[PDB]
Short mmCIF file of C-alpha atoms and ligand atoms in Angstrom, two decimals:
data_model
loop_
_atom_site.label_atom_id
_atom_site.label_comp_id
_atom_site.label_asym_id
_atom_site.label_seq_id
_atom_site.Cartn_x
_atom_site.Cartn_y
_atom_site.Cartn_z
CA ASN M 231 0.00 0.00 0.00
CA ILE M 232 1.49 3.28 -1.25
CA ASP M 233 2.03 6.84 0.06
CA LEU M 234 1.63 9.42 -2.69
CA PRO M 235 2.81 13.07 -2.26
CA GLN M 236 -0.03 15.54 -1.75
CA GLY M 237 -0.30 19.07 -3.18
CA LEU M 238 -2.58 21.70 -4.77
CA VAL M 239 -2.65 22.05 -8.55
CA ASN M 240 -1.38 25.28 -10.02
CA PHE M 241 -3.44 25.74 -13.24
CA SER M 242 -1.83 28.04 -15.89
CA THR M 243 -3.66 29.59 -18.80
CA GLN M 244 -1.64 31.40 -21.51
CA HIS M 245 -3.09 34.48 -23.07
CA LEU M 246 -3.38 32.99 -26.55
CA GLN M 247 -6.85 34.27 -27.51
CA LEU M 248 -5.66 37.82 -26.81
CA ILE M 249 -2.41 37.31 -28.72
CA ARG M 250 -4.48 36.03 -31.68
CA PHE M 251 -6.85 38.99 -31.48
CA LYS M 252 -3.89 41.33 -31.48
CA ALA M 253 -2.44 39.56 -34.57
CA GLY M 254 -5.92 39.78 -36.21
CA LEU M 255 -5.96 36.00 -36.85
CA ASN M 256 -9.09 34.46 -38.27
CA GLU M 257 -10.73 31.65 -36.20
CA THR M 258 -9.87 29.28 -39.10
CA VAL M 259 -6.15 29.76 -38.28
CA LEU M 260 -5.00 26.66 -36.35
CA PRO M 261 -4.43 27.19 -32.59
CA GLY M 262 -0.74 27.80 -31.94
CA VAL M 263 0.14 29.83 -35.08
CA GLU M 264 -0.03 32.95 -32.81
CA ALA M 265 2.92 31.56 -30.71
CA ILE M 266 5.23 30.77 -33.65
CA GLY M 267 7.45 33.84 -34.27
CA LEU M 268 6.97 35.31 -30.79
CA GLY M 269 10.04 37.12 -29.44
CA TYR M 270 11.45 34.90 -26.66
CA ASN M 271 13.66 35.21 -23.61
CA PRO M 272 14.91 31.61 -23.07
CA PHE M 273 15.82 32.21 -19.36
CA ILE M 274 12.33 32.83 -17.98
CA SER M 275 10.33 29.56 -18.12
CA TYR M 276 10.12 26.11 -19.76
CA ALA M 277 7.84 26.29 -22.80
CA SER M 278 5.75 29.26 -21.65
CA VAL M 279 4.88 32.48 -23.46
CA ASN M 280 6.02 35.31 -21.22
CA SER M 281 3.26 37.93 -20.87
CA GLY M 282 5.76 40.29 -22.56
CA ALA M 283 5.61 38.52 -25.84
CA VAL M 284 5.70 40.39 -29.17
CA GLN M 285 5.02 38.69 -32.51
CA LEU M 286 7.67 39.41 -35.19
CA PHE M 287 5.71 38.05 -38.19
CA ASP M 288 2.56 38.89 -40.06
CA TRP M 289 0.68 35.60 -40.04
CA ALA M 290 -2.68 37.34 -40.67
CA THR M 291 -1.68 38.36 -44.19
CA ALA M 292 0.69 35.42 -44.94
CA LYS M 293 -0.42 32.86 -47.50
CA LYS M 294 -2.12 29.87 -45.87
CA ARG M 295 -2.63 26.19 -46.58
CA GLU M 296 -5.21 23.83 -45.12
CA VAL M 297 -4.27 21.55 -42.23
CA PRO M 298 -4.68 18.07 -43.86
CA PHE M 299 -5.65 16.31 -40.61
CA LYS M 300 -7.94 19.11 -39.44
CA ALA M 301 -10.46 20.15 -42.08
CA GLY M 302 -11.25 23.87 -42.21
CA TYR M 303 -8.09 25.03 -40.35
CA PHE M 304 -5.18 26.79 -41.97
CA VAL M 305 -1.56 27.53 -41.19
CA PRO M 306 0.92 29.92 -42.94
CA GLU M 307 2.49 27.98 -45.84
CA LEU M 308 5.89 28.58 -44.21
CA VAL M 309 4.77 26.78 -41.01
CA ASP M 310 5.07 22.99 -40.97
CA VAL M 311 2.36 21.27 -38.92
CA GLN M 312 2.70 17.72 -37.62
CA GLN M 313 -0.18 15.80 -36.09
CA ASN M 314 0.83 14.20 -32.80
CA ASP M 315 -2.16 12.83 -30.90
CA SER M 316 -0.25 11.21 -28.02
CA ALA M 317 0.82 11.44 -24.38
CA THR M 318 4.61 11.56 -23.96
CA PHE M 319 7.05 12.54 -21.20
CA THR M 320 9.56 15.42 -21.13
CA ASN M 321 11.55 14.53 -17.99
CA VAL M 322 14.54 16.43 -16.56
CA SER M 323 16.61 15.48 -13.48
CA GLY M 324 19.89 16.15 -11.69
CA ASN M 325 21.70 14.65 -8.71
CA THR M 326 22.66 18.21 -7.83
CA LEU M 327 21.03 21.61 -8.47
CA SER M 328 23.76 22.57 -11.00
CA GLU M 329 23.34 19.22 -12.76
CA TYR M 330 19.58 19.73 -12.80
CA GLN M 331 20.13 23.20 -14.36
CA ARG M 332 22.38 21.76 -17.10
CA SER M 333 19.94 18.98 -17.80
CA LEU M 334 17.04 21.57 -18.06
CA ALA M 335 19.13 23.90 -20.29
CA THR M 336 20.03 21.04 -22.66
CA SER M 337 16.57 19.35 -22.79
CA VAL M 338 16.16 21.19 -26.14
CA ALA M 339 18.60 22.34 -28.86
CA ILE M 340 19.55 25.82 -27.81
CA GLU M 341 23.16 26.94 -28.17
CA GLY M 342 25.10 28.50 -25.32
CA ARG M 343 26.44 27.37 -21.94
CA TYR M 344 23.78 29.17 -19.84
CA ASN M 345 21.08 28.48 -17.22
CA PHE M 346 18.41 28.45 -19.94
CA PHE M 347 15.33 27.46 -18.24
CA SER M 348 16.19 28.52 -14.74
CA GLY M 349 13.51 31.20 -14.23
CA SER M 350 11.29 28.12 -13.64
CA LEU M 351 13.30 27.30 -10.47
CA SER M 352 11.47 29.95 -8.38
CA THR M 353 8.07 28.28 -8.93
CA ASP M 354 8.94 24.57 -9.62
CA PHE M 355 10.86 24.21 -6.32
CA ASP M 356 10.99 26.01 -2.94
CA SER M 357 13.82 28.19 -1.55
CA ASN M 358 15.08 25.90 1.26
CA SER M 359 14.93 22.78 -0.99
CA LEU M 360 16.91 24.50 -3.77
CA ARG M 361 19.70 25.41 -1.30
CA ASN M 362 19.88 22.03 0.52
CA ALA M 363 22.91 20.10 -0.77
CA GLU M 364 21.22 16.84 0.34
CA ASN M 365 18.64 17.29 -2.43
CA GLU M 366 18.30 16.05 -5.96
CA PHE M 367 15.74 17.46 -8.39
CA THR M 368 13.22 16.01 -10.85
CA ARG M 369 10.71 17.59 -13.24
CA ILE M 370 8.25 15.11 -14.70
CA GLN M 371 6.13 16.51 -17.52
CA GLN M 372 3.49 14.46 -19.25
CA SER M 373 2.60 16.34 -22.46
CA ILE M 374 -0.85 15.68 -23.98
CA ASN M 375 0.21 16.42 -27.54
CA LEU M 376 -2.26 17.34 -30.32
CA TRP M 377 0.07 18.86 -32.93
CA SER M 378 3.34 20.68 -33.30
CA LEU M 379 4.21 23.71 -35.40
CA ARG M 380 7.66 24.28 -36.88
CA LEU M 381 9.02 27.39 -38.54
CA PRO M 382 12.10 26.38 -40.65
CA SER M 383 14.77 29.12 -40.69
CA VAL M 384 14.41 29.96 -44.38
CA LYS M 385 16.02 32.94 -46.11
CA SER M 386 12.55 34.42 -46.83
CA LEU M 387 11.69 35.04 -43.11
CA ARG M 388 12.54 38.76 -43.04
CA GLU M 389 9.95 39.27 -45.76
CA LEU M 390 7.19 37.75 -43.54
CA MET M 391 8.02 40.15 -40.72
CA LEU M 392 5.60 42.80 -39.54
CA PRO M 393 7.01 46.00 -41.23
CA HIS M 394 7.30 47.87 -37.93
CA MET M 395 9.13 44.90 -36.26
CA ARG M 396 11.54 44.67 -39.19
CA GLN M 397 12.24 48.44 -39.07
CA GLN M 398 12.72 48.28 -35.27
CA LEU M 399 15.37 45.52 -35.66
CA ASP M 400 17.05 47.24 -38.66
CA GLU M 401 17.27 50.60 -36.82
CA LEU M 402 18.60 49.02 -33.59
CA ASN M 403 21.61 51.08 -32.55
CA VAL M 404 24.11 48.31 -32.08
CA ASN M 405 26.90 50.72 -31.06
CA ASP M 406 24.81 51.27 -27.89
CA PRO M 407 25.09 48.21 -25.54
CA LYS M 408 22.04 49.44 -23.54
CA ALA M 409 19.83 49.53 -26.67
CA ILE M 410 20.79 45.86 -27.44
CA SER M 411 20.10 44.83 -23.82
CA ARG M 412 16.75 46.63 -23.97
CA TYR M 413 15.89 44.95 -27.32
CA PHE M 414 16.65 41.51 -25.75
CA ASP M 415 14.68 42.52 -22.58
CA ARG M 416 11.66 43.77 -24.50
CA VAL M 417 11.46 41.69 -27.67
CA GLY M 418 13.77 38.72 -27.03
CA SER M 419 17.16 37.18 -27.82
CA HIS M 420 15.31 34.42 -29.78
CA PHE M 421 11.99 33.70 -31.47
CA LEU M 422 9.82 30.57 -31.18
CA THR M 423 10.18 28.09 -34.05
CA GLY M 424 9.06 24.67 -32.74
CA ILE M 425 6.12 24.35 -30.37
CA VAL M 426 3.70 21.66 -29.22
CA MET M 427 0.00 22.45 -28.65
CA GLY M 428 -2.10 20.51 -26.15
CA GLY M 429 -1.92 20.03 -22.40
CA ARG M 430 0.64 19.16 -19.73
CA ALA M 431 0.69 17.83 -16.22
CA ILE M 432 3.93 18.42 -14.26
CA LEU M 433 5.31 17.07 -10.96
CA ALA M 434 8.43 18.99 -9.89
CA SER M 435 10.14 17.46 -6.81
CA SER M 436 13.13 18.04 -4.56
CA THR M 437 14.19 14.72 -2.99
CA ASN M 438 16.65 13.95 -0.19
CA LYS M 439 19.15 11.85 -2.21
CA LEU M 440 20.92 10.68 1.00
CA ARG M 441 17.71 9.19 2.50
CA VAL M 442 15.49 7.96 -0.40
CA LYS M 443 15.41 4.29 -1.50
CA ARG M 444 18.14 3.77 -4.11
CA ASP M 445 16.83 0.62 -5.88
CA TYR M 446 15.97 2.89 -8.84
CA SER M 447 17.08 6.27 -10.21
CA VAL M 448 15.14 9.32 -8.91
CA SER M 449 13.82 9.95 -12.49
CA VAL M 450 12.27 6.45 -12.57
CA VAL M 451 10.88 6.82 -9.04
CA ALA M 452 9.56 10.35 -9.70
CA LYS M 453 7.82 9.15 -12.93
CA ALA M 454 6.26 6.21 -11.04
CA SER M 455 5.01 8.67 -8.36
CA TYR M 456 3.51 10.89 -11.09
CA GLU M 457 1.80 7.79 -12.53
CA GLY M 458 0.48 6.94 -9.08
CA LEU M 459 -1.00 10.44 -8.61
CA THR M 460 -2.77 10.28 -12.03
CA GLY M 461 -4.10 6.70 -11.77
CA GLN M 462 -1.82 5.40 -14.53
CA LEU M 463 0.26 2.78 -12.59
CA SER M 464 -0.35 -0.87 -13.53
CA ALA M 465 -0.75 -3.58 -10.90
CA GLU M 466 2.87 -4.66 -11.75
CA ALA M 467 4.28 -1.12 -11.50
CA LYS M 468 2.58 -0.79 -8.07
CA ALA M 469 4.21 -4.07 -6.85
CA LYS M 470 7.57 -3.20 -8.29
CA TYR M 471 7.72 0.57 -7.50
CA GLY M 472 5.33 0.94 -4.51
CA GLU M 473 8.04 0.92 -1.87
CA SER M 474 10.24 3.32 -3.88
CA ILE M 475 7.24 5.69 -4.32
CA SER M 476 6.48 5.64 -0.58
CA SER M 477 10.15 6.47 0.14
CA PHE M 478 9.98 9.23 -2.48
CA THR M 479 6.98 10.84 -0.85
CA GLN M 480 8.56 10.56 2.64
CA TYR M 481 11.74 12.34 1.44
CA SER M 482 10.41 14.79 -1.23
CA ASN M 483 8.68 18.13 -1.60
CA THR M 484 6.49 18.22 -4.70
CA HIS M 485 4.94 20.92 -6.89
CA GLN M 486 1.95 20.19 -9.16
CA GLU M 487 1.21 22.08 -12.32
CA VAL M 488 -1.41 21.74 -15.06
CA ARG M 489 -1.79 23.61 -18.34
CA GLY M 490 -4.24 23.36 -21.24
CA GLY M 491 -7.67 21.81 -21.13
CA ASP M 492 -10.46 22.92 -18.84
CA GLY M 493 -9.20 24.75 -15.74
CA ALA M 494 -12.28 23.51 -13.89
CA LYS M 495 -11.04 19.89 -14.39
CA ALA M 496 -7.35 20.64 -13.68
CA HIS M 497 -7.56 20.40 -9.84
CA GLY M 498 -8.38 16.77 -9.75
CA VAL M 499 -5.76 15.56 -12.31
CA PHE M 500 -3.59 14.42 -9.35
CA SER M 501 -6.41 12.81 -7.32
CA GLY M 502 -5.38 10.07 -8.73
CA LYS M 503 -8.35 8.20 -9.86
CA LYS M 504 -7.68 7.57 -13.57
CA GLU M 505 -11.17 8.93 -14.45
CA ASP M 506 -10.35 12.37 -12.96
CA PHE M 507 -7.08 12.59 -14.97
CA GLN M 508 -8.87 11.29 -18.10
CA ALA M 509 -11.67 13.87 -17.75
CA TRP M 510 -8.98 16.60 -17.86
CA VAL M 511 -7.16 14.87 -20.76
CA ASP M 512 -10.43 14.72 -22.74
CA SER M 513 -10.86 18.50 -22.22
CA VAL M 514 -7.47 19.37 -23.82
CA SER M 515 -8.79 19.02 -27.35
CA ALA M 516 -11.27 21.87 -26.90
CA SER M 517 -8.66 24.23 -25.25
CA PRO M 518 -5.09 23.56 -26.40
CA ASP M 519 -2.23 25.63 -25.04
CA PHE M 520 1.50 25.90 -25.74
CA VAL M 521 2.97 23.17 -23.50
CA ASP M 522 6.25 21.82 -24.91
CA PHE M 523 8.98 22.34 -27.48
CA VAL M 524 9.91 20.51 -30.65
CA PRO M 525 13.33 19.61 -29.17
CA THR M 526 15.42 19.96 -32.42
CA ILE M 527 14.21 23.50 -33.32
CA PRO M 528 12.61 25.13 -30.19
CA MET M 529 13.67 28.65 -31.20
CA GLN M 530 16.12 30.63 -33.43
CA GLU M 531 18.51 33.45 -32.43
CA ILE M 532 16.87 36.77 -33.19
CA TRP M 533 19.88 38.19 -35.08
CA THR M 534 19.36 35.55 -37.82
CA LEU M 535 16.64 38.05 -38.89
CA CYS M 536 19.26 40.83 -39.28
CA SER M 537 19.81 42.07 -42.81
CA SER M 538 23.56 42.39 -42.35
CA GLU M 539 26.46 40.35 -40.99
CA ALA M 540 27.78 43.45 -39.09
CA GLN M 541 24.54 43.98 -37.14
CA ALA M 542 24.08 40.23 -36.44
CA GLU M 543 27.60 39.82 -35.06
CA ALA M 544 27.23 42.94 -32.83
CA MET M 545 24.05 41.40 -31.37
CA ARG M 546 25.62 37.87 -30.98
CA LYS M 547 28.64 39.42 -29.24
CA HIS M 548 26.44 41.48 -26.91
CA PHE M 549 24.43 38.32 -26.05
CA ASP M 550 27.52 36.29 -25.15
CA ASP M 551 29.51 39.02 -23.43
CA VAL M 552 26.90 41.04 -21.59
CA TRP M 553 23.20 40.16 -21.73
CA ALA M 554 23.12 36.36 -21.45
CA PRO M 555 25.74 36.22 -18.59
CA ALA M 556 23.70 38.84 -16.74
CA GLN M 557 20.52 36.72 -17.20
CA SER M 558 22.25 33.37 -16.39
CA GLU M 559 23.82 34.89 -13.23
CA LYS M 560 20.36 35.73 -11.79
CA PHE M 561 19.92 31.89 -11.44
CA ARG M 562 23.32 30.98 -9.98
CA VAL M 563 22.10 29.36 -6.73
CA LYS M 564 24.54 27.45 -4.48
CA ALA M 565 23.69 25.27 -1.48
CA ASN M 566 23.78 26.54 2.09
CA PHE M 567 27.08 25.78 3.81
CA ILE M 568 28.35 25.72 7.35
CA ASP M 569 30.60 28.60 8.32
CA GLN M 570 30.64 28.21 12.09
CA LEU M 571 30.26 25.64 14.89
CA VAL M 572 29.62 26.04 18.63
CA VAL M 573 29.17 23.51 21.42
CA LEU M 574 26.17 23.66 23.78
CA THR M 575 26.06 21.96 27.21
CA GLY M 576 23.13 21.52 29.61
CA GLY M 577 20.85 19.40 31.76
CA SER M 578 18.36 18.07 29.20
CA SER M 579 17.70 17.36 25.54
CA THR M 580 15.44 20.44 25.06
CA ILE M 581 18.23 22.99 25.60
CA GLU M 582 18.61 25.28 22.60
CA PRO M 583 21.69 27.10 21.27
CA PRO M 584 21.75 30.84 20.48
CA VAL M 585 19.73 32.13 17.57
CA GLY M 586 21.77 31.47 14.46
CA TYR M 587 22.56 27.86 15.49
CA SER M 588 20.88 24.44 15.06
CA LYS M 589 21.63 21.38 17.24
CA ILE M 590 23.01 18.18 15.76
CA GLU M 591 20.56 15.97 17.70
CA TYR M 592 23.07 13.61 19.30
CA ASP M 593 24.17 14.00 22.94
CA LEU M 594 27.99 13.87 22.68
CA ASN M 595 27.98 12.16 26.15
CA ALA M 596 25.52 9.47 24.99
CA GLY M 597 25.85 6.42 27.27
CA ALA M 598 28.71 8.13 29.26
CA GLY M 599 26.77 10.24 31.88
CA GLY M 600 27.66 13.91 32.55
CA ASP M 601 26.06 16.89 30.75
CA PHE M 602 23.92 16.78 27.65
CA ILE M 603 26.32 18.10 25.04
CA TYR M 604 25.39 19.18 21.48
CA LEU M 605 27.53 20.22 18.54
CA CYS M 606 25.63 23.08 16.85
CA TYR M 607 26.03 24.58 13.34
CA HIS M 608 25.30 27.91 11.63
CA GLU M 609 24.11 27.65 8.01
CA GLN M 610 25.26 30.43 5.69
CA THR M 611 23.66 31.33 2.37
CA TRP M 612 25.84 31.68 -0.73
CA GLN M 613 25.91 35.17 -2.36
CA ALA M 614 28.11 36.12 -5.30
CA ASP M 615 29.57 38.71 -2.77
CA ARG M 616 31.94 37.75 -1.28
CA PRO M 617 30.86 35.17 -0.27
CA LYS M 618 32.30 34.09 3.08
CA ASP M 619 34.48 31.37 4.47
CA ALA M 620 33.24 27.77 4.56
CA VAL M 621 34.16 25.19 7.19
CA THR M 622 36.33 22.78 5.13
CA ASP M 623 37.77 20.47 7.79
CA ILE M 624 37.13 19.22 11.32
CA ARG M 625 39.90 17.82 13.55
CA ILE M 626 39.37 16.37 17.04
CA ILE M 627 42.26 16.92 19.50
CA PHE M 628 42.60 15.47 23.01
CA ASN M 629 43.85 16.64 26.41
CA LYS M 630 46.83 18.90 25.74
CA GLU M 631 47.52 18.39 22.04
CA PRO M 632 48.04 21.85 20.48
CA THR M 633 45.37 23.47 18.30
CA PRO M 634 46.60 22.68 14.73
CA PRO M 635 47.67 25.81 12.80
CA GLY M 636 45.29 27.77 12.12
CA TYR M 637 42.21 25.87 13.13
CA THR M 638 39.70 27.36 15.51
CA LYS M 639 39.36 25.33 18.68
CA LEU M 640 36.05 25.03 20.48
CA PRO M 641 37.23 25.23 24.09
CA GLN M 642 34.40 23.18 25.64
CA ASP M 643 35.18 19.58 26.58
CA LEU M 644 33.04 17.08 24.67
CA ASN M 645 33.40 14.71 27.68
CA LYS M 646 32.31 17.02 30.52
CA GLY M 647 31.66 15.61 33.21
CA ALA M 648 31.51 12.06 31.88
CA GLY M 649 35.18 11.65 32.78
CA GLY M 650 37.59 10.10 30.26
CA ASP M 651 39.86 12.11 27.99
CA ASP M 652 39.35 15.82 27.54
CA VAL M 653 38.03 16.09 23.95
CA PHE M 654 38.03 19.24 21.79
CA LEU M 655 36.59 19.92 18.33
CA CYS M 656 38.74 22.07 16.01
CA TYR M 657 37.91 23.20 12.48
CA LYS M 658 39.34 25.36 9.73
CA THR M 659 37.56 27.72 7.35
CA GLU M 660 38.76 28.72 3.90
CA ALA M 661 37.48 30.79 1.01
CA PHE M 662 34.20 29.37 -0.25
CA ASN M 663 34.80 26.60 -2.76
CA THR M 664 32.16 24.16 -4.02
CA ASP M 665 34.67 21.30 -4.02
CA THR M 666 35.53 21.96 -0.37
CA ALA M 667 32.71 23.66 1.58
CA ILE M 668 30.96 21.45 4.10
CA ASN M 669 27.21 21.60 3.63
CA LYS M 670 26.17 19.32 6.50
CA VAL M 671 27.59 17.99 9.75
CA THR M 672 26.02 15.15 11.73
CA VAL M 673 26.99 12.93 14.68
CA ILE M 674 26.64 9.15 14.87
CA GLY M 675 26.87 6.78 17.79
CA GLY M 676 27.25 3.04 18.20
CA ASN M 677 28.55 0.13 20.26
CA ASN M 678 31.56 -0.73 18.04
CA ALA M 679 34.58 1.35 17.04
CA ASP M 680 34.15 1.22 13.24
CA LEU M 681 30.61 2.53 12.59
CA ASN M 682 28.76 2.82 9.27
CA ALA M 683 29.11 6.42 8.01
CA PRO M 684 25.74 7.92 6.89
CA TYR M 685 25.38 7.52 3.11
CA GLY M 686 27.29 10.41 1.44
CA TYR M 687 29.13 11.40 4.64
CA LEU M 688 32.76 10.97 5.83
CA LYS M 689 33.53 10.08 9.46
CA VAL M 690 35.74 12.47 11.37
CA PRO M 691 38.39 10.38 13.26
CA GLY M 692 38.24 10.81 17.03
CA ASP M 693 35.75 9.27 19.44
CA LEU M 694 33.84 12.09 21.26
CA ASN M 695 33.47 9.75 24.25
CA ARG M 696 37.17 8.75 24.09
CA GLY M 697 38.40 7.50 27.48
CA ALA M 698 34.87 7.54 28.90
CA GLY M 699 32.65 4.65 28.08
CA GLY M 700 29.19 4.92 26.57
CA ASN M 701 28.93 4.82 22.83
CA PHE M 702 31.62 5.36 20.29
CA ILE M 703 30.71 8.81 18.82
CA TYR M 704 31.95 10.51 15.64
CA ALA M 705 31.28 13.79 13.84
CA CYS M 706 30.60 13.17 10.12
CA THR M 707 30.74 15.65 7.23
CA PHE M 708 29.01 16.06 3.89
CA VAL M 709 30.31 18.04 0.91
CA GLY M 710 27.62 18.29 -1.87
CA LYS M 711 30.40 18.85 -4.45
MG1 LIG J 814 31.59 12.77 25.26
#
C-alpha cells in the first residue's frame, strides 16, 4: 500500500486568444500559429509564453494552406504542422542543483552554456529545498500532444516580418550596448520556431538523495510517483515501484502544475483516480495551449533576422559578453554551507543554542553520563559577494595536544563531566569553494569502534566519548560537491 505526495494544482492559462486577437488572426487559423514567431527570452520559463511577448511576423496576411488532418483550419504555408495525438514525457533530473540546471538547459537544442530554463526554479521548487545540498531534483512533464508547429529558418523570413518589427530591428543602434540589452529585454534574444500544442501535467520534486530508497534512479521513481497520482500505474508497476514511491513521498517536496484543457477539471488531475485525470485529458482538445517544445528547433537566435552580418555579429557578441551572462547569473544558486560551529552543554535534551545555530541531535555524552552536550552549526547562504568562508575540515584533538595551525578550537570539553579524555573539536575555514565547503555535519553513535558512516558522509576520526565509556561517537561531514 502506497504513500503518494499531496499538493494543490497550479493551473496556468496562456493568453493565446488575446495574442491572436492582437495579430488579427481568423478563427480558421490553427491554434498555436499565434505563438510561432513570438520574441522569446529563453531564461524565464520552460515552454511558456512570457506575458511580454511580441510577434515578429505577419501571419494574418501570410499565404495559408489547409491543415490536412484538421479540415477547415489553416496555417501559414511557411509553417510545418505535424499531427501528434499522443501522451509523452519530457523529464529532466539532476543529482545536484547545477546538474539539474544543465539537464534543463540542454533538454532542447539551444546553443550556449547558460542556465536556460532557470527562471522556472522559483516556482517549480521552494527556496530551502533549492539550497539544501542533500537534495536532488526532478521535473516530470506528461505532455498531452495534439500537434506541433515548426518554422524552418528559411532565407525568406525577413519578408514575412511585420514592417514595424523589421524596421525596429534594422534601426537598432548596435553601437549602444544598452539599446541591445533593452531589445533583448523587451522583444527577445530568440523567437519561437518549434512548439507543441495541447496540455501538460507536471510534478516537480526536490528529494533527499541521502535518504530515499536507491533501488531505482530518482527519475524512474519520480515518474512512477507521477503515474500513481494520475491513476496510470499498472498492478505490476505498483508491486515493483510501490516501496520506492512511498520512500519518495517521505523524502520529497512536490509541486503540481497543469496547463491546457479545462481549468475547472485541472484540480483533480492528481487525485489520482484515472477517471479524474482522463476527464482533464479529454478536455485538452477543446482548449489547447503551448505546453512543450519541438526539441530539435525550439527557437532561433533573433539576429538571424538581421539584414547584415555586421549587425548580427554585434548582437551575438552582446548576447555572449553582456546580456546572457547577466541573465544566467540571476539563477546561480549554491547550497547553504556551514561557516561556524559552537558547542552547547546543559541538563536536558530540550536545551537550545543561540539564535543562528541548530543542534546536531546527538548527545555527545551518549551512554557516558555527565552533561547533555550538542555540537551546533550555523548555516550560511551563498551570495556572489563575497561570499564568506566555509568550514572545510574538522579535527578532534585530546587533552593537551596543540590546536593545529590555524584551526579554531572550540574550548568546551566534549566529555564534561563524563570523565575520560578531555576532547576538543577544532575546524578550519577557507574561502568558499564548491569542491571543499561542508554543507552538513552530523553525529553518529554506536557500540563498536568502526561505525557505518551515513550515506554520502565521511567520518571524522576521534571518538567524542574517548576515554569515557558509553557509545563510540563521531562527527561526520558532507560536501555536496
Ligand atoms: Mg563525550
